[PDB]
Each structure stands twice: as structure tokens, then as C-alpha cells.
Design a protein around this ligand. Structure first.
Ligand SMILES: *[C@@H]1O[C@H](CO)[C@@H](O[C@@H]2O[C@H](CO)[C@@H](O)[C@H](O)[C@H]2NC(C)=O)[C@H](O)[C@H]1NC(C)=O
Ligand SMILES: *[C@@H]1O[C@H](CO)[C@@H](O[C@@H]2O[C@H](CO)[C@@H](O)[C@H](O)[C@H]2NC(C)=O)[C@H](O)[C@H]1NC(C)=O
Ligand SMILES: *[C@@H]1O[C@H](CO)[C@@H](O)[C@H](O)[C@H]1NC(C)=O
Ligand SMILES: *[C@@H]1O[C@H](CO)[C@@H](O)[C@H](O)[C@H]1NC(C)=O
Ligand SMILES: *[C@@H]1O[C@H](CO)[C@@H](O)[C@H](O)[C@H]1NC(C)=O
Lengths: 132, 107, 495, 72, 72, 49, 99, 50, 132, 107, 72
């Protein structure tokens, strides 16, 4: 089925870098866009960035400019988010999910739209805490 | 840039009541807007796309409205299992952004 | 030593004059000299320090605005005025827009209008000058002949620092033993200061000649300032908008700092942190060598059995330094160093240690020499002949005269007719050379100067062409002179 | 502004390299040639002028390389 | 650098004034004339060239104003 | 006896990963982050969209 | 209304770290690992070395350098397609009605 | 020049100018290879992709 | 005095990367070469690589090819060794030390050479263990 | 490449005895060789450089010898505090390498 | 690639045979002749050219053998 399994929660020291994984199933792993959305406990949802499984194109939000890399393994049908220079503010839960995708490379607006952003089957979330 | 305002911040209501939310956009977003329900400790969930549209598998008491900068989400009859926090989502331009959220409290 | 490896170096053979030499030396360069006697010495030039500056000019590369009131009178009558226009610390401008019943007031015309603004500056330029006084050169004059201690590592104490200032002269110097030496600078013949400006930016500086540094645009301000904030200019700085009709506007111009870099290209920079670092430039000293000992004389010639540690080390045309470590008894005895041909002694090298010497014994003494253009057989050994080493120097006699001529050409360029002085005591011909090129190139100097790579080479080819037109044999005075000075000076310069 | 009068021919040049050393020249060339590529027509008309005026051949060449030097 | 490419002839203009607005032209002139004042000799030699080459009087005038334009 | 090593020529290699991108067919010339690390190989081409 | 962003020009930057190297020989053209990440800037130049430098052979040597590169200031330049872009006009009557 | 075993003595310049991926004597993890343009060719069939 | 203080022992998971620090004192931090030598408990000494404080030139052994980066901070007069793709074999103690030599950049064999590379002025070592 | 062989691997000896080690090189290393002493849990330490030379601060009972490929380290009189493992070090060519080591056991 | 620039004329040789040892020459000829057999027309046209240009008989011969050499 449409499904997402993220890796389990982790904790890191400030200034560090963390790598969270997003595995998917139930469709063609190259047929949907991936986005990462974060939620701080005392806050709502925040859109971190985007990766396209097909071909590897990527994009990110201004706030995380410089701080976040996205990669994939097609063979495993899995996406990797990574954040650098971890700081206490970064402590939150992270989420990943999809889009119904025209084709090559990632980001569209005009072609209708995805009609979500980590709400349908983005996964189960995972907790990460930046602490000393 | 695009600032999505969500109102009100919270509501308490008795079962069966009709409830509405409003989201106001700093720019004209046309028909791109979304309505989330999220229960605590759960991933967010779908309700409304294109501001006008139910998803399949969603109960019918849900509805959405509004066009240029302004929008209204509506539940016809409040139901207890609907306790959650709700959101609206601007996709336009792709500096992707969310509404701050609205919590419910059952009476 | 301390010369080796710097390339670009200045061998000066012989003295004569009863000990008279003329040396022209500048930082990246250095000089090695010889005579039919006296120890080979090297002149290496290091930091030049001008102590007391004095500050002429204030240039600011950045500013900001605020307050900035403005006014307009009317249709026709009057040209508007505003009180803050009186403090020149503001900037002012008149413009003309229009007014009328929309503006509300009088009868419908194109109106006068004014504006003013506060003006306050960001980063400055400190530019100062130094009088041909308070400025000094520091030289290391290093002996050859062993110890160990690098042909190199200008750090470390051998040739002292021999400081000099125009305020003094005659440059009395001493080294161990022979080391009595007399030098005489001519710093007033140096960079020609009072034409010069030292310009400190945020922490890099630049040495540029005065006039240009006067004429340079951007906000003026005199050395006195402190509170003055009196800046005189600003017209080339903050520009004013006047969109189609109404209003008008004032705009901070924005930092030019980089663009100013783009300007200061074509100039040697200078680091200045504490008081001066000054590098580059050049100077010419005259050297009187009289009282110099050979550093040892009446000795015995080694004993025998040298055992040698190193290489060959052919640098830059010749010198071929070798390092050897003597083994034996005989105590500081001369080292029988020789450079000869195949067998059948024709023997010719030329040796620059002159009179190499053993020290305290154990210590890696070293040598440098100049084998011929060809095969070379080098022999340090004596009683059982000890060590012969085969060598081959490649190159060509002709090629060496040629490259030499290239050197002397670069010398004709860069460092002018002081170059003609760079030899020593050519009697007539040298002097008359220095004068002929003196006034001669002087008139070519500056007059057709201020020109760059492009225009130089181009004007060159065109004038040599018009020369090739062959009238009245004057073509040569065109032509050969033309193409030479133009082309050759074309590519060499601009570095 | 300081954009031009870039203290070049001047004098005083030392043995040691100065600033943009061995760039700003080939900058200058590359710059202007680029602008030539962008506005070929002006090259055309100018050259025509060269074929019009003077035109004892070497002359043409000269006044043409003015076209090069016209303005960045 | 940006010191020279100063987006001038180009096109597109408009009915409204643009930027340096009746300055940068008279700037251009004033600065090159200034530099002429500073280096009179080069003017002299150049003019001489004008009297040498072509010389077809109008020609002289042209190549002269050229050799004025030639300073970067 | 004593040599010293100047050059590394490789006669064979292999590829992997190998992401790619395009902007759409005027504005922009596409970019990709891994173009950063010169350990990758890069090329621009032009197709259509 | 809707632009889209093509280009990033930076007008200012800064440097740090900035290692450098030389092989000293003849043999070899020097290398340094950080030359790998193009976020650095690199250059080859040639100076010289010898017994003063201490090592080999007495010649004019190859040498390299690299630096980390980071920019604070930008230019945002965007473009707009000959679409949603719009004009606004006031078309005013004459005939009285004060002011 | 040592290949997998066999070696060859060749004069310097040619061995400089020789094509194929460059890499300097320092190595040390560098994986820094210049070149590669003459290696690893890229297809671009008629229109789409590459 | 001539002195070296390395950071304390650490343990990591396989495939990871570890960063060990070497601080020095008692001389001009740019006047001596740095080398890293490892000792596995059931083995002797193994030469990992070299960094030059002045200028940053570096080199490494063939065995660790691809696996080890060396950097420095001159301001702190400190060197950093880092190993990547950690594996159980990597578990060992690491050491850092110096050389008197000539400089700009780091090899030499003909100039000076030797002189207690790491026997009189060697750090205190540090233990690193690659384990799950 | 510069394979360094160390012999023997271990020795046991009574106090005061003279002890010698030998290191053999696959290539001629000339005068570049070294002799370490290292006590357990301690950093290694200096003894011999250029194969011929004591360090200042080193006791005099230590000596070293050999030239082309072959070398011998020697302690004139075994002393109890000398219990350690000893090494020889090839610096030549810079694929820097050590001898395998020789342990001592006091009798 | 290494396919060409096969370190031939160069120098240094020696008293002992080198590598392809009395082949690669024979190779070079045989292959180019083979390619001649495959594309006779090009031979024809080329020869015609030889009869066209120069033609100074020896000339013809020369430019002909070149136009044989010319195929890469
Ligand atoms: C350059 O000169 C310095 C100063 O003499 C040399 O440093 C000396 O080296 C010897 C070698 O054993 C020491 O005994 C001295 O104590 C050192 N002097 C000091 C530390 O002030 C330096 O070696 C020379 N350059 C070279 C390449 O040898
Ligand atoms: C331009 O139009 C405005 C809007 O009508 C004028 O402002 C009005 O002025 C009248 C005069 O009594 C007032 O009664 C209105 O209330 C004003 N409108 C407002 C305040 O919105 C303005 O006067 C006109 N310009 C001129 C020069 O008269
Ligand atoms: C101008 O601005 C300054 C701010 O520095 C403040 O004194 C005030 O706003 C103005 N002062 C005048 C107009 O004298
Ligand atoms: C390439 O992909 C593999 C798995 O497919 C992954 O382990 C590896 O890290 C990737 N390499 C890069 C440089 O992204
Ligand atoms: C640059 O140096 C700083 C110390 O000032 C250090 O923290 C940082 O890791 C270094 N970065 C690189 C890429 O070398």
C-alpha cells in the first residue's frame, strides 16, 4: 500500500549533523515528489525542502539555506534528509511525503498540484533532539 | 513574503455544532489552499484541496470555500472524534508555508 | 649565500678603480660580486622603513543619509530655499518639476525645487606622504665560504643588517675578520618621493604617485579634518533620482571599494601595519672594498681525504654549489678545490668561494662554482687524489651571451639609466651612455607615457610602419629605434 | 568614477609585480572583444567606413582598429 | 569589472529618465579631457602621427580624435 | 634506486549515483548541488520541454 | 505578479582557512585535498625552491592554493513571462466637479 | 611508467601531454582527477533526456 | 616545553567517521611537520599520513587511500586527523608528532631528515574503537 | 616497499648483560635508521638516530651500528629499567615504516 | 586518445628492438591500403584533383600520394 517508514528518533549534540531516512512503498518510487516538513512541539508545520526521486533534482527553503542536504537511493526506494550545524531550535519531529508528479525534476506549480504536503502518507514522523 | 493568517487560533464547541475557520492570504493565491486535520501525536492528515474539495474517504460534514485571499473551512455537525488541530496551506509560488493552526475543545 | 635560488641575480665581476664599484639593487633581487681578490660578498635588500608620515587626504568609500528635507517655491517666481542648505555638511541640489491646481497652489508651470541631506561617511582612506627624510634602508651583506646554515635562510645572523639613512652616509660596515666594508647610498636618487603617496585602506595599502592621487574623484577632505565633516565633492557620490515629473529623491551611492581596487591596479601595493613595511623600490649604492682580508691566507693545503655529502645543485646558470664534510686532522686548512677539463690539465673553471676554507673541522662546508658550457671534471682531491666528480653543463656560450643581453635589456627597462650606472667605471663610454640615455629617454620618458599595454604595442607597430615607408634614410631613426623601444618595452612592462 | 583612470602607464613600476598582474590587460581585451560579439552590426558599419575614408589600405586597417577601440 | 560594461546603448530606454540622467556623458568627456591635460606629451606625439599618416586633411582630424579616444 | 612519483593516469573507472537536472527552456541554466564536488563529472546540454 | 529567479550575483565575500601547497621539484604539480570541493577557489602559480627552502634540486617550483568562499550580499535577479502582468489605467472625465 | 606489471621508459613531454584522466603525484585520497572530458562520454539521443 | 595533548579516547559505529585532535606547544607551530601513526593492540606501529602546519600541504599512505583527511587550525596551533568509513580493524590507538625540517610543504627525504619523529616528543596517544 | 625486518622478535636476559638487535632492509637505506624504546602504556621514545647516534639525555650504554641494509643496536650492560619493546625505523623514500619490535624479559 | 600520438619518431631509440618490432609500420601501410580498397571512388576523385591542380607531372604524383595519406 501507500506507505512510509522513517527511521527511529535520534538525539545529537549541538553543531552536529543528523541523517533521517524515509522509505516508501505502494507505488513507483520514481512517480512522486518527496518533501520534508518539520514540526516543533510548541509550533505548527514548517516546510523544509524537496527532493525528486527521479534524477535527483532538489530544492530547499530559505530558512534552512546552507544547512540541509537531500539524497536518495533508488535501488532501495528510499530518501535521505540530512541537517547540518544542529542547534537546539532544530529539535523537532520530521516528516516526509509525496506528490503525483509530472516528470523529470522537482518543483511544479502550474501543472495543477500535488494536493497535499506530508499529510496523506508522508510517514509516521520521527523525533530528533539537539542537546548537550 | 506570502503570509498566511489563520483565524481563529482556537475554538471550543458542543457536539453537532457547525464550525468554520478562515484563512487570509497576503497575496492572491487563487484556488491553491489546503485544510489539514491533525490529531495529537499523529501525523497531519488531509481534508481539503483546492480549497473546494473533499478527499475520498473523508466524511461529508467537511467543506471549504473562498477564492482570492480569503477562505473558510466548515464542519456542518461537530463530532467528538473530530477533536484536533486544523490548518490551511498555501502552495502558491513554492516558499511553501502553513497556517498557524486552530485547536478544538469539545463541550 | 642568501642569494642562491632567488634567480634573477646580478653577477658583478671585478672592481678596479683602486676599489670602486656601482651596485643597483632592489628587494626581490640581490647581487653577488667578485674581485681578483677579497671575499665574494652578496648584497640582499630587505624592508625599507619610512618613519614619520603626514596625512594628506580623507577619501571615504561609503556614507549614509538621513533627515533630508526638501522644498519648492511656486510657479515661476523664486528659486526655492531651505535653511539647512546653509550647512555644507548637507548636500544640496536644485531641480525642476512642475506644479499647479493639483499641487494646488499657483498658476500652472514647471517649478523650481530643491533638496538637502545629512552626510556622514563610512570607511576612509588615510593617504599620507613622507618627505625624502625619515626613511631608511636595511641591507644584509652576506659572506660566502661555508659554515653550514643555508645558501639560503636569510634569517640568521651573518651579514648584519647594515641600516642606512640619507640623513647619514658612507655606510660603515663590519663583519668577522675581513669584514671592514664601506658603502655609500644615494637615496635622494631613489623613488623620487614628494611625487609619492602612501595610501592605507582598511589594512592593505598602495604606493601611487601624487598627481593622480590628487585628481582622483570621490569625496574630498583635507588632512586637518577631525570634526570637520566638511567634505567637498559628493556630486560624484550620492546620485539623485528624478522620476518623470513630480518629487525627486536622494540616493546613497554605494561602496566603491572594489572599483577602487580595479583602479589601484597598475600600481605596486604596499603592506602597512606598523609605521611602514615598505617593500619594492630600488636603490643604488657605491662600494669601496679596500680594507678587506681574504679571510685566511698563509695556511697549509688541507691534508687529504674529504668525504662529501650532496648532489651537484645547478641553479640558474653556473654556480653549482656543493656541500662537503672534511675528514681528518689538519685543522682549518685550505681546501684544494679545482675545476678542470678532460685529463691533460687545461684547467679552467671559475671558483666562487674564493679561497674556500675548513672551519673548526666537523661542519658541512660548502662551495659554489661556474663550470664551462660543456663537460666538466671537478676535483677536490689531492694526495691520493681523493674525489673526482663528473659533471656536464648543458647550454651554450652563444646562448649565454644572448640571455645576458636579455637581462641587460630588462635592466635598460624597469630600473632606468641608473641601470647604465649598474656596471662600474667604464670611464668615458659608460658615463656618456648614462647621459645620452638620460636626457634622451627622458624626453621619451613621460612624453608618450601614461599609456598601457594595448596602446603601447599598437602605436609601436603603426609608427614602425610609417617608418618602413623609406624616406631619406631617416627610417632608421624611425624604425629600428621605433620597433625596439616600442615592442620590447611593450611586453616586458605592466607587471 | 574610479571605474576609470586606473593608474596604469604612470611610472615608477618596480621589479615586483603590482596588482592584477597579468590580468587586467587580457581583461581589457576579452571585455571589448565580447562587446564586439554582442553588437556585430556596429562592426559592419564601422568597417564600411574604413573602406570609405582614406583607404590607402594601411589606413583602412588603422581607422578600423579604431572601431575596436570605439567604446566598450 | 562592472567598472566597464555600463549597459548604455543597448535599447529599451523609455520615456522616463534612467539613472545618471544627463551626467555620465558629460562625466565621460570631462574625465578624458582631464587626462589629456595631465599627459600633454602624448597628445603631441599622437597629433604628429595624424600629420604623418593619411593626412588628407579630414583624415588627420579623424585619426587625431581617435588617438584622443585611445586612452582607457 | 630512488624514484619519485609523478602522475596518476587511470585506464578504467565506473559511475554511480549520477543525478541530473533541468530548469525549463528559457530562464535559468539549471543547477545541482553535487556539481559542487569536482569528484563528480558535470555537463550542460540542452533538450526541450 | 509572478516572477521567477534567475541569477545569483554576489557583490561581496570573505575568505578563511585557505591552505596552500607546493611540490618543490620539477617533478610534480602540487596538489591539495581541499582543491576537491569547488566551494574553495584554487590557483596554480610558480615560485622557486632550493636549499634555502631546503629540499631538492634548485629550481622554479610549482605551487598551489585554495580558499573557502562565502558571500554576504546578493542580487536577486528574476524574470517574468509575458503573462500574469497587468496595467492599471485611470480614464478621467473632464467637466467640472471641483478640486 | 609502471602499468599492471610491465613498464616503459618514455621521454617526459609526451608523457605530460598524453590525454586521459590527469592526477598529480600527491593523491592522498584526493580522487581529484582533472580531465574526464576525454573519458566518460555522454549520450544525447534525439531530444529527451541524456 | 615540547608537548602534545591529543583529545581523549572515543568509540564509534562501523562505517562512521572519527575526528581526533592533536594540540602542541613549546615551539613555533609552523616549524615542524606532523604525522599520524597508529598502533593496533596486537600489532606494532603503522604510518598513517602527514600534514604540514605551514600552508596546508598533506599526504597519506596507500592503505588509508581515500579514507583519511587532515586539517589544521594555526590560530589554535592544532592539527586534526579524521578517518572515514570506520571499520573494526580501525580500532587502535593513534599518535601524532613532528619534524624539524625545511618547509613550505610536506614530504622531505634529502633535507636534514629523522630526529625523533615520534619517540621523544610524541603525544600521549588516544584510543579509538569501532564497535556496534 | 622498504620492507624492514627486525630480529630477533624477543629476548630474555639477565641484568648487566650485553644485548644486540639487528634490522635488515630490503633496499639500501644508507644511514637512515632509528632505534626506539617504548615501555608499555607509554608513548614510544628516542634512542638512536642515523643508526649511529645517541640522543642527549640518553644513557651511554646504548649504541647503534650498520650501514647499507643491515644494522645492530646494542646495550652494553642490561639494566632492569630498560625492560621495554624496541624498534628500528626506516625513514628513506617516505612510505614511512617501522620494524615489528623486540620485547625484553628480565632474568 | 592514446590511439594516436604513438611515441614514434621522438628519439633515444637504442641498439635493441623496441615494441611492435617491424610490425607497426607494415601495419600502418596495410590498413591504409585496405581502406583504399574499400572506398575506391574517393581515390578516383582525388586522383582527378591531382590531374587538375599544379600538374607539373611530379606535382600530380605528390599531391596524389598526399590525398591518399589524407584519410585519417
Ligand atoms: C638558518 O639559520 C638558522 C639560524 O642559525 C638555523 O637554525 C639553526 O640550526 C642549527 C642546526 O642544528 C641549530 O643548532 C641552531 O640552534 C639553529 N638556530 C636557532 C634555532 O636559532 C637554520 O637551520 C638555518 N636554515 C637551514 C635550512 O638550516
Ligand atoms: C483631490 O481629491 C480628494 C478626494 O476628493 C480631495 O479631498 C477632498 O476635499 C474635499 C474638499 O472639501 C473634502 O470635502 C473631501 O472630504 C476630501 N476627500 C477626502 C478627505 O477623502 C482633494 O481636495 C482633491 N485635491 C484638491 C487639490 O482639491
Ligand atoms: C535627523 O536625524 C537625526 C538622527 O541621527 C535626529 O537627530 C533627528 O531625527 C534629525 N535631526 C535634525 C533634523 O536636526
Ligand atoms: C550513491 O548511492 C549509494 C547507494 O545507491 C550510496 O550508498 C552512496 O552514498 C551514494 N554516493 C553518493 C556520492 O551520493
Ligand atoms: C576553517 O577554520 C575554522 C577555524 O577558524 C575551523 O573551525 C573550520 O572548520 C575551518 N574550515 C575549513 C573548511 O577548513
Amino acid at each position: 500500500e501507500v506507505q512510509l517508514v522513517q527511521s527511529g528518533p535520534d538525539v545529537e549534540k549541538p553543531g552536529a549533523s543528523v541523517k533521517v531516512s524515509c522509505k516508501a512503498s505502494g507505488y513507483t518510487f520514481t512517480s512522486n515528489y518527496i518533501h520534508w516538513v518539520r514540526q516543533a512541539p510548541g509550533q505548527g508545520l514548517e516546510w523544509m525542502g524537496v527532493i525528486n526521486p527521479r534524477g535527483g533534482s532538489t530544492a530547499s527553503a530559505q530558512k534552512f539555506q546552507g544547512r540541509i542536504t537531500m539524497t536518495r537511493d533508488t535501488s532501495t526506494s528510499t530518501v535521505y534528509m540530512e541537517l547540518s550545524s544542529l542547534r537546539s531550535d532544530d529539535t523537532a519531529v520530521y516528516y516526509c511525503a509525496r506528490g503525483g508528479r509530472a516528470l523529470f525534476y522537482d518543483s511544479y506549480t502550474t501543472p495543477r498540484d500535488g494536493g497535499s504536503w506530508w499529510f496523506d502518507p508522508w510517514g509516521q514522523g520521527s523525533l530528533v533532539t539537539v542537546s548537550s | 513574503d506570502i503570509q498566511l493568517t489563520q483565524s481563529p487560533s482556537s475554538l471550543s464547541a458542543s457536539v453537532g455544532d457547525r464550525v468554520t475557520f478562515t484563512c487570509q492570504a497576503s497575496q492572491d493565491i487563487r484556488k491553491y489552499l489546503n485544510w489539514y486535520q491533525q490529531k495529537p501525536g499523529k501525523a497531519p492528515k488531509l481534508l481539503i484541496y483546492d480549497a473546494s474539495n473533499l478527499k475520498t474517504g473523508v466524511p461529508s460534514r467537511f467543506s471549504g470555500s473562498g477564492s482570492g485571499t480569503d477562505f473558510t473551512f466548515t464542519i456542518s455537525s461537530l463530532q467528538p472524534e473530530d477533536v484536533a488541530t486544523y490548518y490551511c496551506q498555501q502552495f502558491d509560488d513554492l516558499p511553501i508555508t502553513f497556517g498557524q493552526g486552530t485547536r478544538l475543545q469539545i463541550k | 649565500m642568501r642569494c642562491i635560488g632567488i634567480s634573477n641575480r646580478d653577477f658583478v665581476e671585478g672592481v678596479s678603480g683602486g676599489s670602486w664599484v656601482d651596485i643597483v639593487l632592489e628587494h626581490g633581487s640581490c647581487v653577488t660580486t667578485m674581485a681578483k681578490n677579497k671575499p665574494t660578498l652578496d648584497f640582499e635588500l630587505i624592508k625599507t622603513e619610512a618613519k614619520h608620515p603626514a596625512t594628506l587626504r580623507k577619501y571615504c568609500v561609503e556614507a549614509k543619509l538621513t533627515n533630508t528635507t526638501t522644498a519648492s517655491r511656486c510657479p515661476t517666481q523664486g528659486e526655492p530655499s531651505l535653511n539647512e542648505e546653509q550647512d555644507k555638511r548637507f548636500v544640496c541640489k536644485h531641480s525642476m518639476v512642475d506644479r499647479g491646481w493639483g499641487n494646488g497652489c499657483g498658476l500652472f508651470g514647471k517649478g523650481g525645487i530643491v533638496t538637502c541631506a545629512m552626510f556622514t561617511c563610512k570607511k576612509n582612506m588615510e593617504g599620507k606622504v613622507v618627505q625624502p627624510e625619515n626613511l631608511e634602508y636595511t641591507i644584509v651583506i652576506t659572506p660566502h665560504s661555508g659554515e653550514e646554515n643555508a645558501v639560503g635562510n636569510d634569517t640568521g645572523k651573518h651579514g648584519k643588517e647594515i641600516k642606512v639613512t640619507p640623513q647619514s652616509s658612507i655606510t660603515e660596515a663590519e663583519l668577522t675578520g675581513y669584514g671592514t666594508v664601506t658603502m655609500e647610498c644615494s637615496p635622494r636618487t631613489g623613488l623620487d618621493f614628494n611625487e609619492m603617496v602612501l595610501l592605507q585602506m582598511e589594512n592593505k595599502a598602495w604606493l601611487v604617485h601624487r598627481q593622480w592621487f590628487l585628481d582622483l574623484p570621490l569625496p574630498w577632505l583635507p588632512g586637518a579634518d577631525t570634526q570637520g565633516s566638511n567634505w567637498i565633492q559628493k556630486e560624484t557620490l550620492v546620485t539623485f533620482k528624478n522620476p518623470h515629473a513630480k518629487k525627486q529623491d536622494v540616493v546613497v551611492l554605494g561602496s566603491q571599494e572594489g572599483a577602487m581596487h580595479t583602479a589601484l591596479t597598475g600600481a605596486t601595493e604596499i603592506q602597512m601595519s606598523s609605521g611602514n613595511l615598505l617593500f619594492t623600490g630600488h636603490l643604488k649604492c657605491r662600494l669601496r672594498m679596500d680594507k678587506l682580508q681574504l679571510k685566511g691566507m698563509s695556511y697549509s693545503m688541507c691534508t687529504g681525504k674529504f668525504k662529501v655529502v650532496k648532489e651537484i645543485a645547478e641553479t640558474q646558470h653556473g654556480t653549482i654549489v656543493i656541500r662537503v664534510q672534511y675528514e681528518g686532522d689538519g685543522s682549518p686548512c685550505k681546501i684544494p678545490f679545482e675545476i678542470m677539463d678532460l685529463e691533460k690539465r687545461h684547467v679552467l673553471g671559475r671558483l666562487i668561494t674564493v679561497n674556500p676554507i675548513v672551519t673548526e673541522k666537523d661542519s658541512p662546508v660548502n662551495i659554489e662554482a661556474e663550470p664551462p658550457f660543456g663537460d666538466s671534471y671537478i676535483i677536490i682531491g689531492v694526495e691520493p687524489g681523493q674525489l673526482k666528480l663528473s659533471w656536464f653543463k648543458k647550454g651554450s656560450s652563444i646562448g649565454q651571451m644572448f640571455e645576458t643581453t636579455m637581462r641587460g635589456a630588462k635592466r635598460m627597462a624597469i630600473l632606468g639609466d641608473t641601470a647604465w650606472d649598474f656596471g662600474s667605471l667604464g670611464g668615458v663610454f659608460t658615463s656618456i651612455g648614462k647621459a645620452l640615455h638620460q636626457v634622451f629617454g627622458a624626453i621619451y620618458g613621460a612624453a608618450f607615457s601614461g599609456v598601457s599595454w594595448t596602446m603601447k604595442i599598437l602605436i609601436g607597430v603603426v609608427i614602425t610602419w610609417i617608418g618602413m615607408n623609406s624616406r631619406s634614410t631617416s627610417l632608421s631613426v624611425s624604425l629600428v629605434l621605433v620597433g625596439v623601444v616600442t615592442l620590447y618595452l611593450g611586453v616586458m612592462v605592466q607587471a | 568614477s574610479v571605474a576609470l583612470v586606473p593608474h596604469v602607464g604612470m611610472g615608477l613600476e618596480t621589479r615586483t609585480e603590482t596588482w592584477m598582474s597579468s590580468e587586467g590587460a587580457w581583461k581589457h581585451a576579452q571585455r571589448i572583444e565580447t562587446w564586439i560579439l554582442r553588437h556585430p552590426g556596429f562592426t559592419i558599419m564601422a568597417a564600411i567606413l574604413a573602406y570609405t575614408i582614406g583607404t590607402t589600405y594601411f589606413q583602412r586597417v588603422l581607422i578600423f582598429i579604431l572601431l575596436t577601440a570605439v567604446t566598450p
